Amino acid sequence: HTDPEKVEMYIKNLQDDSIVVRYSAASALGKIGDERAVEPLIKALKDEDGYVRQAAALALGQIGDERAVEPLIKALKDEDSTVRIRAARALGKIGDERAVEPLIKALKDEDWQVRLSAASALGKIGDERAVEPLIKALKDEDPSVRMAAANALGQIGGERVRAAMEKLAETGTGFARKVAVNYLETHK
């Protein structure tokens, strides 16, 4: 169900002078989910204001249009950490494989919350290319990132994860060794 008048009113509001009108319009269009707003939101992803970029990234993920896969891959390189978080989660929601290698790089971001969102997104995509980076992420300095990597590994599943857990159970230490030990006990 939609309102074509409201959708076009919010599209025009993305070209407004006020940051606050621009931010509200990107927010509103995300909740609506109309694909008519994909091209204007892709341009709002490049906006001068950080909040407007954050709302545009969140909105594009909520719509789930594949046209947004490449602009969201670029948004993973944004100066604002919360834009990088939303770009990762938006890419996790869409599920496109093109985002796997850029998310793997995002698992090594300076910001802990971006690393948290990258681990989560790779788990939702389920691509086995993420198995080795996620095992490395089990050694992360931040405990939330470790938990999200351990959860993402369980979500991927399969023979490659089990084999990586087998090696970790013997060769590993601390939390990574415990994750591997609890995995083999719940997957045999």
């Binding site: 940051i19 606050v20 009108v21 931010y23 509200s24 927010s27 509103a28 909040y51 954050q54 709302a55 969140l58 950490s81 919360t82 978080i85 939303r86 989660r89 919350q113 948290l116 969102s117 989560s120 405990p143 939330s144 990132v145 938990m147 999200a148 959860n151």
Partner: protein, 111 residues
């Protein structure tokens, strides 16, 4: 709803006055707006315990699962008040992963 106030409230979470930061967290909590989850997750690592408490409560009212692991980590906070505000938030969010974490956090303290 009214997103117009949300950017200045997120900025108010960076204020030098912890009372202003806790006030902003309370305001974002009443709104229940998912637009503030990232900012409030960062606010869970604030130097002030009164802010961490306020951010944890606000995250509970928003109900977005992105807060689940940071709130689980806030169960081992030095400030005992922050601990039950994090536990209250996890209860409100209603994600199954919190259950295992609560029973695990009991085991780590018992040893």
């Amino acid at each position: 709803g009214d997103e117009r106030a949300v950017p200045a409230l997120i900025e108010a979470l960076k204020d030098s006055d912890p009372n202003v930061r806790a006030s902003a967290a309370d305001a974002l909590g009443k709104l229940g707006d998912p637009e503030a989850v990232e900012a409030l997750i960062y606010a869970l690592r604030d130097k002030d315990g009164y802010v961490r408490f306020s951010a944890a409560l606000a995250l509970g009212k928003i109900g977005d699962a992105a807060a689940v692991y940071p709130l689980i980590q806030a169960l081992e906070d030095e400030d005992s008040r922050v601990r039950w505000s994090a536990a209250y938030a996890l209860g409100q969010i209603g994600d199954p992963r919190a259950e295992e974490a609560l029973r695990r956090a009991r085991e780590d303290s018992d040893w």
